[PDB]
Amino acid sequence: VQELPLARIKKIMKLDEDVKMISAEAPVLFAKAAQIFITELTLRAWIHTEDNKRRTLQRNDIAMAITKFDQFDFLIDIVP
Amino acid sequence: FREQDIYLPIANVARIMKNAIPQTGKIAKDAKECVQECVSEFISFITSEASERCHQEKRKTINGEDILFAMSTLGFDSYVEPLKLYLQKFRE
Amino acid sequence: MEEPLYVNAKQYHRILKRRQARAKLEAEGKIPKERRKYLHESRHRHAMARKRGEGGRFFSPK
DNA sequence: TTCTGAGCCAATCACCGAGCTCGAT
DNA sequence: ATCGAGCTCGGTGATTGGCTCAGAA
Known about the structure:
The complex is a heterotrimer. Chain A is mostly helical. Chain A has 3 helices and 2 strands. In chain A, helix 1 crosses helix 2 and helix 2 crosses helix 3. Chain B is globular, with a radius of gyration of 16 Å. By secondary structure, chain C is an all-alpha fold. Chain C has a single domain, classed as Helix non-globular (Single alpha-helices involved in coiled-coils or other helix-helix interfaces). Chain C has 2 helices and no strands. Chain C is elongated, with a radius of gyration of 23 Å. The termini of chain C are far apart. Chains A and B meet through helix 1, strand 1, helix 2, strand 2 and helix 3 of A and helix 1, strand 1, helix 2, strand 2 and helix 3 of B. Strand 2 of chain A pairs parallel with strand 1 of chain B, so a sheet runs across the interface. Chain C: Belongs to the NFYA/HAP2 subunit family. Chain C: It comes from Homo sapiens. Chain C: It is found in: Nucleus. Chain C: This is Nuclear transcription factor Y subunit alpha.
């Protein structure tokens, strides 16, 4: 039911010059992966929003989840 | 390079974000913009491992196994089954 | 910007090459440094054109 | 407290997906 | 043979901003 542009997921993978041909199944997997990712990042960040007694989730909520989870370590110079 | 060429649509991102939270809740623009950047990094991140392992096996096309393997390699091993599962209800 | 095993062990080496990839795109290609207010000239002109109801919203029938 | 910034509407049109042709494995 | 890049084409949902008061400060 959910969705995300497959074409766009591809366009993004193909930013890399080393990445030349891509199977059909791949974006399809990524659609769902990104969906789980975006889902479980937000979920984590919101804790930090409630912790602080806000009702708006904000940039810095996010950074505060990234710093508190090893699996997300790869975004470090993404969000300083 | 345009924004539309390198990020997922913001409204698609917000939609999902908004699902993850109290229905009453709110989200900063800068917050959405941010996850949007992340998700794009996440896409690129798995790929470069997959591209490494995929060219390392003397192939030219990044496929299913490639991703999943890359995910195990980088600690997303938890995502692995639910994808596989979701990978059996859309293909033939 | 630099560090050793003070990050997920599993992930370390990738982060590193992906730093390289970007530092390339930055140096050479085109990574937009800042966000644009809007994305398409036409969708801007159209949003500016739309009749608006009360509250600055779009409208709806009555 | 003061005052910044997110949600709310839905109509156009850029972009996505479903068809293709062609060249590779 | 199968399976992907790259066109084209037509159908459609992301994109879009002004006023108001949640709610960040």
